[PDB]
Amino acid sequence: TVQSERAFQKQPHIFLGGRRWYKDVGLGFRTPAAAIEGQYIDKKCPFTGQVSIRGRILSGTVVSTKMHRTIIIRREYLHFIPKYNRYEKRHKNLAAHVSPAFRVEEGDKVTVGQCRPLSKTVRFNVLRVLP
Amino acid sequence: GRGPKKHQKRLSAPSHWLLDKLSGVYAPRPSAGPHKLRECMPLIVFVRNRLKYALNYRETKAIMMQRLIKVDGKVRTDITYPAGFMDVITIEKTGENFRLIYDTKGRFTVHRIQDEEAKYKLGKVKRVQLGKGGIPFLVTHDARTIRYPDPLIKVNDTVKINLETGKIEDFVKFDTGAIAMVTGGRNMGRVGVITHRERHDGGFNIIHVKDALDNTFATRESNVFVIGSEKPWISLPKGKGVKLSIAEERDRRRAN
């Protein structure tokens, strides 16, 4: 249920023009059908929320979805080393908010875009899910 | 405590000022105005390090506030006023006008204009919005605010602003085939023709510029300055914005 909390939710300045609000983030990403026709509420969703996307657009593999609306992304990359002419299998873990529009499981590949600091760790929003 | 800096180091001063390294420890610091400081040009450097009138700090300070130097027709008593691009400097005591235009080396030169080129300026349109009362207004590269521009001036256009009223005589649209000057990057002071415009969403679009010698280049629209629609609207410095290699530059000296 949408109103499963202690306060009414949510859309700030959409007085009950009279329709559910959404936007497009630009940069070639298409707004999911769930955002258009969904009754969910999320103030950090890039489409139905106030958050804008600007900066770096990254991608990786979903590792954990045990959280509520945030996922952890593993970004495998190879580090080049002079004096050996070889590489190292390195990796980084990234925290990104996932909108309720997507149905994401662990192991999927997603693309994230940089936004303002949403929490202590999260600075990215999920934009596309491949599988 | 913590606050803005007021001094400048001679070693860390901009290279294009061509300052003597052993003259002193410090260098003139521009105050504010026709910036960015990278790049701009202080008035003291223009009158002392380019004209020597004005041999040291004391004499140039006397000249500044004897009210004899008109930047764009306006009296400036600032010893370190940031004279910038397309600005017109006037000395009525000797009776001539100077304009600041980059050369091929990437440095400001002492360019001279005789009588009529000091009546206007070319400025690059940086901002168009609606003013305090729904009144459209336009901002140029030299912080000039125009309260009533033509509706067809969108972005990056070059407007000919009159130098005694601020009114616009004419404007040039930013499109291929216009005469452009590169005001930044590695190709400072290079004058050519816009040929290609590729759009990359992300704010780093590239402009291809062709020189008089059929030379192709590339630059962002942060350094492309439009000069003329078919012919340049101002007088170019010697060389006409064409860069020659080290060999041909040496050959020009050996021949001359």
Added chain:
Amino acid sequence: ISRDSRHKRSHTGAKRAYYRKKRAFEAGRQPANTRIGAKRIHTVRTRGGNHKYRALRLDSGNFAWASEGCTRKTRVIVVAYHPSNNELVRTNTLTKSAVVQIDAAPFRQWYEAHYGQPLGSKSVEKKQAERFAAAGKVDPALEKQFEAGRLYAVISSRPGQSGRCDGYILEGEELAFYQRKLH
């Protein structure tokens, strides 16, 4: 008081080390618990030289009836609900998103003199008669609020910041949602 993240543990669990003395811009100030009473507005100087007004015991506020764009300055009576903390209700603390009781006198005066219809010179009545026909009868949920004399209102301003208690009247499913919370 400071708002820096240097004193917190890292996301990995590591403990950060001491870096610098506390900075002036990373503060950090004492919260003001605005409540109901005779007006006390304190002013505090901020970083830009600007001024912030602390609300202490506010009593009257400007509220909006958005169904027809009628806004009147009324009297805040008592806080009825607060999603953040239940103790803020008991002590009658005024913060944003707080459901309160406000006087219905200014809004009833406007409604009667605008529509000419009860809520509990021939040109004038037809002016009022046409208005009532176009709009229609007020929602029953807003009706029962009126004869009791007090209206549900959510505060939408920040009294500890602007020194003003402003809000809007509950109406629709938003009203129905908070009525469930209050029972």
Added chain:
RNA sequence: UAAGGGAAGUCGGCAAAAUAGAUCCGUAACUUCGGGAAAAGGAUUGGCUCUAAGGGUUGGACAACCAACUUAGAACUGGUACGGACAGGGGGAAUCUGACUGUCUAAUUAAAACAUAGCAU
């Protein structure tokens, strides 16, 4: 019961004082790994007004009628007092000795003595 000192008294801290319940935290050397350990050492505790959780029965994530205790949270309050009387471990570092529990000189010696399991003949 005693001001200040705190074993300077005495063969010797003998006698007395101090600690003491419950809840939460914290706990070393050593070790036969079972303990030491209640180690050491800290904090809270009253009254009043509330709130929440932990069940049963009969009718189809519900409704109604019953039930007596335990735990947790919060305001308010007081001459900062609250296991308010009662009840209720002082602790630590070592040396000698007996492994331990147990037993005896009824009426001066309870111990390192006796016994014990284990070992051997």
Added chain:
RNA sequence: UACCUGGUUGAUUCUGCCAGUAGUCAUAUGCUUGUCUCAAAGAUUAAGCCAUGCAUGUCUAAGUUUAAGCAAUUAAACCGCGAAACUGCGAAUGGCUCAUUAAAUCAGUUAUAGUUUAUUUGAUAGUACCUUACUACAUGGAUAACCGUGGUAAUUCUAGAGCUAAUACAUGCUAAAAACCCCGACUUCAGGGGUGUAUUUAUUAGAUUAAAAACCAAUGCCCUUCGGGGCUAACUGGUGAUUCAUAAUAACUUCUCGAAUCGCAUGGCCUUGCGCUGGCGAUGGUUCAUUCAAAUUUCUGCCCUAUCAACUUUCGACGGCUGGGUCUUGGCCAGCCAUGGUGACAACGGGUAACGGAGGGUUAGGGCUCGACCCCGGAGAAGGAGCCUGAGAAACGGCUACUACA
């Protein structure tokens, strides 16, 4: 300028090191030391302690002059210079050091659509809004400097008493006219109120994806050769992307700003009234842009150590929500809910005689090593913490408290 030599043996070939050799912008020390140019120089250890002296003050025609000050001035009506003091500005720059510090600082590359900004530069404000006894040909009360009386051994300590100024502090009228919303007596249609900007809340506009025929529910309007046609119009910014720029309505405020300030030149007009007008500047002022910036912020990259293998989470650890606080975002903080977050690709812990870098030395290539130190960034001012003024400080040649020293 891709290089070797001596040394284990009676002699040999090796492994292998020792020694020799050269460079160092790399330090010390010994002996010696005529000239020219340039020049490092209390870092190492004691970020140990400091006598003394200096290092931050500042006036233009253009803020305030009765010096019982000078200089020429008039009985008077106050200025040429100009002290003291009030006011404004700066003192948050610079200079010094490297103690702390190992995803921290820093470097390259990003964002602020998540923010502030003294100064500079360009624009930029007409409003019958409402208070005083009233005035706009101009409002009010204090306080220095000064005169005189002291205190204490002593300070860049100050009191009591008499004045007196503001660009110090506090008040205060406004500009016509247009247009718009509301109230409206008046038989079926005059009049009054509000409308600048600044603040807060609520609402509306801020468009544009391929075309046509039906009961309209509502007045259908106009054109009616009284069939039928058109029509509730024309226009409408920007970003890759916004609830953007901007406009409009209903209200609000311990109601901001909208000049009770200064100098030069003094000129024009007719109703000749000490009437109406006239520029250049100085300072100051709201909003927007800009400038010097600051502050956070994305990606990637740091020496040794497993005789550091599990770490975080009671009392924030990962996240969600509401609010508070901040210039603003954010577990930054307060409440409620869930059990997550990191790690063998080295997490966590420890060491550094570790500030980071641009760079110094030396090298055929590949490398090794140093970087306190003329430049950029960070931090500190005996050791911690707190704070005022201020655009800007957690300031120390500012203050307050504790410890040590004195």
Added chain:
RNA sequence: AGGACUUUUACCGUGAACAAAUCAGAUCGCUCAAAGAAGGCCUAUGCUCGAAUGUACUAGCAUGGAAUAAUAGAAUAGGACG
């Protein structure tokens, strides 16, 4: 300029951007040199060239290349096509 259809990574080419100072390096008889950015010409009246150029590993941005090294695709057809 609006939209649709592009397997995704590694790798290589090119381009933009990428403080000075240092380093390499161009010019000028500071009496040469270390240095410095000067200077030179005309008798003069004043006339003029210069104060270059290269250097941005790795990470980030844009495009091209499609061998090499990885990964998916239609099998209980839940496959493609108007």
Added chain:
RNA sequence: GCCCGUCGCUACUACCGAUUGAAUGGCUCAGUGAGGCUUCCGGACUGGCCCAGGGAGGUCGGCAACGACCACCCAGGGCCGGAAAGCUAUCCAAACUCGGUCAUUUAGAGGAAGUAAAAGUCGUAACAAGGUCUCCGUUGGUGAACCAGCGGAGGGAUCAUU
């Protein structure tokens, strides 16, 4: 020829070691807690307004008391402000005490090693079949090198017996 070990003299290095050892620094539980911001009251001191009144001259009307008009100076009540000291409750929190933990130095009777120095004492274990072939693992013993038992190796003194 070479060479091993105990013992004895000298010097140096590190190790164990009773001493609840000592010192320094970082972090940290608990207690007390200076100072300060915010906040609740408080209000000395000091402004403004209002209410009617006290002292003192010039005239008129009334049978006394009295009242009316024109100009000065001063006692008592009410209301609205600003504001120092102080004070209430949170918050930031120096500092000290008391424990805990980590890191780094440092004293110590005595004990047990190593290294070096040479014309010290005792043996002769190894290098030849070194005169008992040598060596490895384990166990026991002996002034010392060493010896012995069990199993193994040849780096053996046998690359081989039809």
